[PDB]
Structure formats: C-alpha cells, structure tokens
Amino acid sequence: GISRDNWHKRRKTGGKRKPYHKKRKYELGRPAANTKIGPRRIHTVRVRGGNKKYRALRLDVGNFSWGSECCTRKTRIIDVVYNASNNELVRTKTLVKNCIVLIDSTPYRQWYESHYALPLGRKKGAKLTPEEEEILNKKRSKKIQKKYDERKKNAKISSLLEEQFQQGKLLACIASRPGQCGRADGYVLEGKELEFYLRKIKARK
Amino acid sequence: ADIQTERAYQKQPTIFQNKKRVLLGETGKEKLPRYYKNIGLGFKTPKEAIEGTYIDKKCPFTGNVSIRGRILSGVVTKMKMQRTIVIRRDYLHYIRKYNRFEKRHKNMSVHLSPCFRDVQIGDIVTVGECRPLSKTVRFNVLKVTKAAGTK
Amino acid sequence: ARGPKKHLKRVAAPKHWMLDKLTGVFAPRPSTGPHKLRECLPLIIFLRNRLKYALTGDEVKKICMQRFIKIDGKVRTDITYPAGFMDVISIDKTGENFRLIYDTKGRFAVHRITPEEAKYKLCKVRKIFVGTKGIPHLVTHDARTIRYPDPLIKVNDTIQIDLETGKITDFIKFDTGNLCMVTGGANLGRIGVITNRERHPGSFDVVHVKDANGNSFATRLSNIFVIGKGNKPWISLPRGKGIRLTIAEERDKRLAAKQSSG
RNA sequence: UACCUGGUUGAUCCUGCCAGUAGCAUAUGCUUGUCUCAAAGAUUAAGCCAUGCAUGUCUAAGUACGCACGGCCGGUACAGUGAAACUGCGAAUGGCUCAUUAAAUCAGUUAUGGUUCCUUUGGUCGCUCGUACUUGGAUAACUGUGGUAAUUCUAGAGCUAAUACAUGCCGACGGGCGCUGACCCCCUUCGCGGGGGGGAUGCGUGCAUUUAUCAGUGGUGACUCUAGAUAACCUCGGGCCGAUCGCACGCCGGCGGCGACGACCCAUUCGAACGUCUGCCCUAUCAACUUUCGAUGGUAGUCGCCGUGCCUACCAUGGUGACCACGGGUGACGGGGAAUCAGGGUUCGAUUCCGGAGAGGGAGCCUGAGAAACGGCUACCACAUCCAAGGAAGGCAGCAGGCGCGCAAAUU
RNA sequence: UUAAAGUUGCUGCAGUUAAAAAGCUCGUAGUUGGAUCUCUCUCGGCCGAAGCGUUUACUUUGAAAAAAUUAGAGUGUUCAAAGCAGGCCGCCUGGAUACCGCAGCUAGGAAUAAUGGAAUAGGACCGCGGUUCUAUUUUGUUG
RNA sequence: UCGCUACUACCGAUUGGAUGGUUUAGUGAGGCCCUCGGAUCGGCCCCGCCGGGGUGCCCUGGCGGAGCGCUGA
C-alpha cells in the first residue's frame, strides 16, 4: 500500500500541498523483501508492462569476480561482516547491494593452482594430498615446462589476500541488487578497498 | 584519507584500481587514472577535473550526468550546504496594462562540483540542466566567472 | 484517461484532410502504422472524399474488402491505414496509380502516376545503428528497416526503395545544391534547392532553401526531404511545381484563366 | 457614431452623487400567423433514486458426436448450416458532471543521453554441437440426481475436445571458435639450449539475464552509447529457439505455393509518466514559516517502469520570506474562447474542442499492455431494497423518467 | 454585468477654501538619476568553417506556434444568418490568408539605457631564457 | 433633556442536546507481503492373482492392498 509519489511532501518553501488526486497505481511501492542467507527461495513479481522481477528471499550461492586475475567462479556466501548503511542489517544477515560478505575461496584456490602451479593458502607443514600432487608436481612437455615458469614470475599475490586464503574465507562485496534480480553477484575485495573495509570492520568492534 | 570521509568506500566506479603490476610498477609510481569527459557545448573541462582527487557522482565533468536542455545563468547567494549552492535569477516581468515592468526574482538550488573551488558569493555562474539530482536540484554548475569587484 | 484513446473528434482532425463541420461528431481516427496520425491520409479519405469512388464509410469497406487496393505493393484491408508521404497506391481493377505528395498549400493531392514509376519510392533515413553481431541497419520514416545499407548512407539523406523486393537501389546525400521538399511547418509542400544549413548544437538545424523563382525560405532540419540530386526530381511533381503563389497572383491566375472560356 | 440629459438655490457658477440611456445574459409577465437554424436540471442539493435500456464479439482459417435441421452412402475419421459452452479479444474508449484543486491543474516551451508501451508497420525467428509420420492429464456444453423463501447461487455422479492446461524431441550437423593438451614433426645448436608447425584427449560455446575485466564497426554537441573480446552466471513462482489452423493442388519415398494464428528481442506508431523555463483572482484584523513525525543537502542502500527524501540508516544545519513567503478565502477546474469597447480597458468563461479530476464519503486491491476501474471486487462510515428473520443484494455527476430543491431547465 | 465612468484616471482625475498633504526630520528596500568615447586567425573550393567582442534590455526579420471561434478571400443558401461548397458541355475547379500577447529559439541593426575592460601595474604586444608534465610520427620489422 | 408599538444582533443561565474539522492517547475491518500450516488430489515405488515377448531374470495389460515410504499440486 506504499506510495512513492512526490505530492505527499511539503514544498521547498515549506508549505504543505493539498493533493489533487488519490493514489494512482503507477505510484506504487512494494515491501522490502530482505534477502537472507539460506537455501534458495525466489518469488517472482509482476511489474509494469507484464515483466518479471525476481524478488529473492534466501540466497546461498552467487558468482563473484576476482578482478586482478580475470576469474569468475560461483562461490558459497557465508556471512555479512559489515554494511555501510545500517548495522542492524549485519546482525539480521540481510544481503543488500554493497554489503561486504564472506565467501568461500576454494573455487579460486583450484583456479590458482591450475593456472600458476603454485600452492596457495597451504600451511607451512604442507600436507599435500596426492590428488593435487598431480597438478602441483605434474609431468610437463618441452614447450609447457617453459610456459608454466614464464607464468610463474608475476604470480604474486598481495599478502592481505593470502591471510584470507589461509582460513579459506575471502571478503567480497555485492554489486547486484538481490531483491530485484534474484542473484547475489559482485567482486572480491582487493587492495585499497580491502584495507579500507578491513579497518572499518576492525574499528567496528 | 582526504577522500574517504564516508562510511562506504568512495571510488570512481568506471576506473579499475586493482590492476596487477610488475616491479617497475610498484617502484615507479602509484598512479590512479582518472575519468573525465567533455561536456559538449563548449565548456572547457577544468584542470582540477583532470588532476583532482575528489569523487562526485553528480559532477558534470567526472560523474554520471549529461547536460541537456536549457543552459542558464545566475549569481551566487548562499553557499551553506554540502556541494550545492543557491543562485538567484533576476528578471523583469512586463505588465501589459501599465506598459511597465516590475522587478522579479527566483531562486535555484544548484549543484556545485568540487572542481570549482574558491567561489565567493556574488558572482555570475552558468548552470546546465540535467536529471533530478535531489528533491529541489536539477541544474549543475558549468563555469564560474568572477564579479567585477575582484582583481 | 486510463490507457489509449480510440476515437477522434472531427474538429480535432488534421486541417488538411478537409472534413466539413456538419457531417458527424467523429473523424476517421487513423490506425497505428508507419506514419504519425497528424502526418497521414487514411485510406477512407482517399477513396470517399478525394477520389469520389465511394459515397459512405461502408462502401470503403466494400471496396477494400475485395482486396482491390495495394498500398506500397501490399494489399490493405484496413480503411484507416495511415498512408503518408511518398506512398504508392496501386488500384489494378481500374488501372490508376497515385503517389501521395504534398502540394503547394499544405495538403495532399490526387497525383496520378505512371505504373512505370510505381515500382519505387523514396524514403528519408532517420537513424542508423549497428548491432546483433555487428550488422548495420537503417530506419526510414516509414519504419522500414533495411539491414546492410551502403556505408555512404548517413542520417537525413534519401534512399530509393524498390517496392517489390524492399532493397535500396541508389541514394542521394544531404548536401547543398540538392532539390528538397518541405514536409512540415508553414512552408510545407514547397520545393527548392538547399542553399545553406545552419547548425545549432543542442537545438535544431535550420536549412535555408531557395525557390526556382528566387523565393528563399527556411525550415528546421526535420521538415526537409531531399528529392533530387542537383535540380532534377527523382519523382514526378504535381500540377503546380512546389512553388507557392502569393494570393494576389493566385487571384490573377483565376481572373485571367476564366477569360479562356466561351 | 470618440455623444450625454433631469435633480441641491430667490437666481448663479461648481464639486459631487442619485436618476435616466444602450447593449448583453438568467428569470418572468402579457402577446404570438408563416419559414430557416438553435440552447436547454449549470447556478440551489457532487441531493435521493421506482422501471426499462446504455457492451459486446465468428471468419475459409482455435474447439462441433446437440439430429436442432437436412444431406449424398450407407464400414466411408470429420458433407454442410449451426444454438450452446470452452478459448481469444474488448469492456481502461466513448458518455456525464465540475465537488475538490492557487505554482496545483493548465498554457506555451523544452527533456527523457532517467522510462514503460496491447496493437499496427518493418526487422529477426534452421546463427545454440547437445513418441517426432505427433506426447500427458483434466474440464465445460450434454446426460442424469439434488438443495435453498430468495440471487446472472450452485453441489454431487457419468462422458468428451483445444491455439485452454501441460510436458517434450529429432533436423540443421558437417563442423567452426576459444582454453587445455599427451604426443609427433621441422629449423638452429657438437650437445645443452633456443625457436616454429601439426595434433588425439577432456571443458565451454548462440540471442536475451546478472556481475567483473580488456581494447577502441558506427554514432552524437556531449555516453558509463552502439557494436567487439574475455571469464562466469542464467531464477523449478523457469527466457526465446512453432507438437497450431485454412485454400488450391502438386513436382521427381522425398521436394513444394499462397495465407491465418502465434512469438523473445529491436525499431516504429498510438500514447502514458516524470521533469525544465515563464505565467493566475482577493486578503497583512495572515509577518515570519519549515525542522521530534523529512524540513534543505551529502553518502550507502531499499523500493519503484526508471530520475529523485520516494523511503531507511548515519551525518551536515540547512531551505523559503516585503520582489508579499506562510496561512485563510474564492458565488475558482484551467485554457481555446464570450460580452462590451474610439484608444486604453473591464467582466464572464459550469457548458459540446484540448487537458485535469470524480463516480454517495474516505481506503485497499484482483485482472490486464494499460485501472488504484466503481454499468469490477473487499472492507469501513452514511443511506437503503427483499426476507419464510436463517440470509441475500445495492450505487443514474450515462439516456429517458420520478421525487426533492428552488426564480430557474424538454420524451420512461 | 459592460459602456456611459476623466465617478478608480497607464493613457487620464483629485488633495488652500468642496472628501483629502503625514507635526517635523533622519533613514534601509523600492523608484528615479548630469556632461562625455567615429571583426579576425589555423583549413577546404577571392568564396565557405571555427572563433568572437563584456554581458544584456530594445528593435527588425525568420520558424515554431491544434482545430473551431474572430478578421478576411471565393461562391446567387431563392436573399440572409449559414455552408464549404460548386461550375461547363465526362471535363474545370476550390477547400486561401491574416491574427495567434508574455516566456523560450534565430538572424541583422547599434541610437538609447545598464555593465565591464590597466592606477600599490602579479597591464597589452613582442621576441629572449629557465622549472614540471608530456605528444607521438624518426631511424627496413623487432626489444 | 424627557412619554407608546415592533424587529436585528449579542450577552444570555441551562456544565440543554446533535454533528463536523484539527490533533493527544488507546483500539484496528479488509486487502497485500513474509514465516508457518497441510484438509484434500495425484505420481513413482513394493508385494499378491496372473498373460505375451525376449531369455530362474527384464518390459508390458487388468486390478487389489499397505507403508509416519518419497516427492509434486
């Protein structure tokens, strides 16, 4: 029953308007269906023109983009760590746009060790199971043994990312509006944005 | 840090600022490329729009607005908000019976970009029409000429 | 209202249809089609009012329902189909062919044309865009989209459409010295050579035109239709040659043309 | 046709008002032979409503097993005409009225580079590499059995369709393009080494969707545009990639020609919406207002067709005001226009065209391209109809007509 | 209700005695204000672009301004108010045009009226030197 | 200065009654959205009575039953 008209306000001078019609249908607004963390549940809406809006109520996965490596994989959303509008939305674990989430780094770890042949996020004791020994210590051909070592020089990672790879949980920021498209996509936090939101979460407590 | 005064991260959204570099990139220079664009009606983009560090999504030289419609003017009266000023336009209204005019005025709230820094009240400013930026703001400051009592 | 209007009052009709005051409350209300409803002549007005073939708005139904009427080479069974500028009306049971061109006074005209000319029409290019795996398109003023155009076709030019196939044969570009017809405004239906085109960026281009007698006029750019390359029209012209007579000499023509009688 | 005339004193010249005079509009009186056009329940009561009508719809081309007719010929799936009912579409227009409403509506002028658009017209529709010579279950009309005082109320039982509801291939199809990549080959090097080709194996491939990154065919006055490339996603309340009907009949078991319905997306048409600039009557016995509860602005989002305090969180303390804000009034819907008029003006504009609003008063929805719809639904407040007292149904500011009101307005 | 009403007055009234100048003065807003000042650079085929100059008001032209109404052209409705018809012996016609304030576009004029332009010269025009960033052509391609 | 008849309006006891408009507080029909709920309606199973085909086993046709089976509406 919400109405997002402009005529229920005061004028710029401060005078109140006497209205000249009743609430029209194109002025409507619908309730906020806040997207929580759970197994997927979307409910389609019928909007103007007969089109569809995917009003998501629970979401569990969403594909994110490691920007500096051109790697887009579908991860598992874990948590909400910080929301820069309201902080009661963090204790309610609501997924909105531009909220910082914890994702699962395991699809990116499998891409990194497949593309660069370097162990990422392993402990110092380095218990290396044989099923990934064949991708970390493979048998290379004559032209491939130089190609992998040619890739291996610039295969460095900023150390703020590797501490997240140690525990398996990356920081990500949602860039799509889940209550309107039904998806929770986004990107992985890298660099200056990462060390901004890190100290925001640290000073939050 | 001189930009990030907010609670979310101020970032120019078109520019990717996490490109991977090599040892001549980390030792050479920490270079943030900036996004600027040309307003198409013969308004020069200021050098502050090309050299600044401000972030503004409603700046007509660096943000996401396009100037279309009427291009107008007015003089500054009150600069007491965040990034927006109040200009008053003065005009004469012809009364037909008396064959005479009368002084009239109307105010406009108008967005002032941070590239136009050191603007004092009482100088002529060109404004340009865009989409609604807030409840009362629909024009954007395009060039600032100074009052004749300057030097 | 709530949703679109389906009626047209008679006094609210376009002036150039020349509907009288006392025949009804309503006017024919053109169907949606290629043309704006202010810029068109419905097929009921061309048959009943102009040509005097029909006598009522039921005989236009009885004529169009025998499929006797082709508008741009396709048979039209809507009596309020908006025929507009440069549209070819082929009636094959009688043997006539018409083209809708404006005359000097801002209306349309019964312009009978030869069936050797009725195989083509001109269109004006309105927007050119690429898309769909990099394939270029036109959009003309009839909403005809002709993908794969010539790369030297740009906006505001004139193509020549073959009406049996739909394809472009050859074109004219927007330049000075080209023969143009004005299709809107107070200089509507006037034919002259493009003299000059003044640019107003962020507003409308003004295109100064020169007559074949020396009478210069101007329009906005959107009321300009390039008809010929140089001074030779690629279509035929009406009985008057697109040259507007002032009312004094328009009177002199009548009071001297009655003196040929006896 | 740029006009005056009687009235103050014993008489005079003035100020000055009363009175006449001429239109034009509402009423009304008396009178009224012909003929042509023509307004007409606006004003008071946006008061109240008996009765009837004002919105429906089939082509060759969605569904025919009604003998309801008749018709070949009687094994001939369906000759035909066709009520009914399912399906589709419309009912959002037109008509009526003027209660609201004073920067609001509206008019001119621009904008959508900030959005949706049934339809029409043009485009596109083997562009995707992975039972089909045809898929599945119901349901009306119909038959048959009932309930209730009562309604365009419906319940149960038995059949049967689809362009309703669903599910779902083949074909094009041979490949191609990107990642991978055992292996093989070639050149050079004594050799190591360096460089270049071919390649089985697995993975992903279109166009729409959502995110991120790269480079810079066509465009604008200016795009964060249009296209291109790369990595992924693609909603079970699913996104396209046709299980459809007709008419003439065929060409060498295949290959067919004209249509009708569909259909995502693009364009167009018809619009709608939200904005820009300028403009309106009376009042100061209305001079300060707005800001807890959004007032002005900033940041992040929510919602919404989209731009925005539209809304929420955190901030900043602003925004309008003698150039008359704010408040009140209007015997105010606004214009196009109408009366009068030397020139200037003044007053009217409910009323047939454009735009707004509203269907007794507020409010909320369903369906749909489009409605906050009232000849749709759900409530509440106000009236009010039937009743067997348990219930049921309402909305004339549509056309007629009635009552009431009134100085004041036509035919069921 | 309009004219008459120059009895609302901008045109165009009145204010000593007929109704009426504030007791006097200062004063912000408003309103009004004295003389004065005679188009060029980089390109295309001498002719077009692009720039102006300090910004406007004014004036003239243009284009855009719904139809109906109003004005007005044509036409013997039997005249007229109307209408958009008609006319000739199948043809020939018409269905024009003006007006459409203020605001907004456009182009010419430069009188009037507002406004700038250097006065502790961080002033104009010249060629001289320095500091910082940096174009993308140059070296048969290639770093 | 001082005598008769009536109207207009206000005060006007009566804490006379009835109804509007602004708000204080409390209450809150009905729709929509969310989280549940699950009356009923299928489907797939499993056995039992059994045919045919292929070769004790698989697929088919009629049913019947049971299960807090496991799914859809």
Swiss-Prot record, chain A:
Keywords carried by this UniProt record: Acetylation, Cytoplasm, Isopeptide bond, Lipoprotein, Membrane, Myristate, Nucleus, Phosphoprotein, Ribonucleoprotein, Ribosomal protein, Ubl conjugation
Region (Disordered): 1-26
Modified residues (Phosphothreonine): T129
Membrane topology note: Lipid-anchor
Residues bearing PTM N6-acetyllysine: K36, K127
InterPro entries noted in UniProt: Ribosomal_eS8, Ribosomal_eS8_CS, Ribosomal_protein_eS8_euk, Ribosomal_Se8/biogenesis_NSA2
Residues bearing the modification Phosphoserine: S159
One of the record's GO molecular function terms: RNA binding
Lipid tethering residues (N-myristoyl glycine): G1
GO cellular component labels: cytoplasm; cytosol; cytosolic ribosome; cytosolic small ribosomal subunit; endoplasmic reticulum; extracellular exosome; focal adhesion; membrane
Gene Ontology biological-process annotations: cytoplasmic translation; maturation of SSU-rRNA from tricistronic rRNA transcript (SSU-rRNA, 5.8S rRNA, LSU-rRNA); ribosomal small subunit biogenesis; translation
Cross-link Glycyl lysine isopeptide (Lys-Gly) (interchain with G-Cter in SUMO2): residue positions: K169, K192
Localization per record: Cytoplasm; Membrane; Nucleus, Nucleolus
Pfam families, alphabetized: Ribosomal_S8e
Principal location: cytoplasm
Biased amino acid composition, Basic residues: 7-25
General function of this protein: Component of the small ribosomal subunit. The ribosome is a large ribonucleoprotein complex responsible for the synthesis of proteins in the cell. Part of the small subunit (SSU) processome, first precursor of the small eukaryotic ribosomal subunit. During the assembly of the SSU processome in the nucleolus, many ribosome biogenesis factors, an RNA chaperone and ribosomal proteins associate with the nascent pre-rRNA and work in concert to generate RNA folding, modifications, rearrangements and cleavage as well as targeted degradation of pre-ribosomal RNA by the RNA exosome.
Family: Belongs to the eukaryotic ribosomal protein eS8 family.
Subunit structure: Component of the small ribosomal subunit. Identified in a IGF2BP1-dependent mRNP granule complex containing untranslated mRNAs. Part of the small subunit (SSU) processome, composed of more than 70 proteins and the RNA chaperone small nucleolar RNA (snoRNA) U3.
Protein name: Small ribosomal subunit protein eS8
Organism this protein belongs to: Homo sapiens (Human)
Swiss-Prot record, chain B:
InterPro entries from the UniProt entry: NA-bd_OB-fold, Ribosomal_uS17, Ribosomal_uS17_arc/euk, Ribosomal_uS17_CS, Ribosomal_uS17_N
GO MF term (any one): rRNA binding
Lipidation positions, renumbered (S-palmitoyl cysteine): C59
Citrulline: modified positions: R21
Modified residue annotations for N6-acetyllysine: K37, K44, K57
A Pfam family matched in the record: Ribosomal_S17_N
Gene3D superfamilies xref list: 2.40.50.1000
Post-translational events: Citrullinated by PADI4.
Residues carrying Omega-N-methylarginine: R68
SUPFAM superfamilies: Nucleic acid-binding proteins (SSF50249)
Primary localization class, coarse: cytoplasm
Residues spanning the membrane: none
BP terms from Gene Ontology: cytoplasmic translation; ribosomal small subunit biogenesis; translation
Modified residues (N-acetylalanine): A1
Subcellular localization, as worded in the UniProt entry: Cytoplasm; Nucleus, Nucleolus
A GO term from the CC aspect: cytosolic small ribosomal subunit
CDD domains: Ribosomal_uS17
Post-translational modification Phosphoserine, affected residues: S66, S109
Keyword list, A-Z: Acetylation, Citrullination, Cytoplasm, Lipoprotein, Methylation, Nucleus, Palmitate, Phosphoprotein, Ribonucleoprotein, Ribosomal protein, RNA-binding, rRNA-binding
Family: Belongs to the universal ribosomal protein uS17 family.
Function recorded in the entry: Component of the small ribosomal subunit. The ribosome is a large ribonucleoprotein complex responsible for the synthesis of proteins in the cell. Part of the small subunit (SSU) processome, first precursor of the small eukaryotic ribosomal subunit. During the assembly of the SSU processome in the nucleolus, many ribosome biogenesis factors, an RNA chaperone and ribosomal proteins associate with the nascent pre-rRNA and work in concert to generate RNA folding, modifications, rearrangements and cleavage as well as targeted degradation of pre-ribosomal RNA by the RNA exosome.
Quaternary structure and interacting proteins, as annotated: Component of the small ribosomal subunit. Part of the small subunit (SSU) processome, composed of more than 70 proteins and the RNA chaperone small nucleolar RNA (snoRNA) U3.
Protein name, as recorded: Small ribosomal subunit protein uS17
Organism expressing this protein natively: Homo sapiens (Human)
Gene: RPS11
Swiss-Prot record, chain C:
Family: Belongs to the eukaryotic ribosomal protein eS4 family.
N6-acetyllysine PTM sites in chain numbering: K232
Major subcellular location class: cytoplasm
Complex formation: Component of the small ribosomal subunit. Part of the small subunit (SSU) processome, composed of more than 70 proteins and the RNA chaperone small nucleolar RNA (snoRNA) U3. Identified in a IGF2BP1-dependent mRNP granule complex containing untranslated mRNAs.
Disulfide bond entries: none
Taxonomy, superkingdom: Eukaryota
Record's protein name: Small ribosomal subunit protein eS4, X isoform
Its job: Component of the small ribosomal subunit. The ribosome is a large ribonucleoprotein complex responsible for the synthesis of proteins in the cell. Part of the small subunit (SSU) processome, first precursor of the small eukaryotic ribosomal subunit. During the assembly of the SSU processome in the nucleolus, many ribosome biogenesis factors, an RNA chaperone and ribosomal proteins associate with the nascent pre-rRNA and work in concert to generate RNA folding, modifications, rearrangements and cleavage as well as targeted degradation of pre-ribosomal RNA by the RNA exosome.
Domain S4 RNA-binding: 41-103
An example Gene Ontology molecular-function term: RNA binding
Source organism of the structure: Homo sapiens (Human)
GO annotation (BP), single: translation
Crosslink feature (Glycyl lysine isopeptide (Lys-Gly) (interchain with G-Cter in SUMO2)) location: K229
Pfam families: 40S_S4_C, KOW, Ribosomal_S4e, RS4NT
Keywords: Acetylation, Cytoplasm, Isopeptide bond, Nucleus, Ribonucleoprotein, Ribosomal protein, RNA-binding, rRNA-binding, Ubl conjugation
Subcellular location(s) of the protein: Cytoplasm; Nucleus, Nucleolus
Gene3D superfamilies named among the record's database cross-references: 2.30.30.30, 2.40.50.740, RNA-binding S4 domain
Keyword Acetylation: yes
A GO CC term assigned to this protein in UniProt: ribonucleoprotein complex
InterPro entries: KOW, Rib_uL2_dom2, Ribosomal_eS4, Ribosomal_eS4_C, Ribosomal_eS4_central_region, Ribosomal_eS4_central_sf, Ribosomal_eS4_KOW, Ribosomal_eS4_N
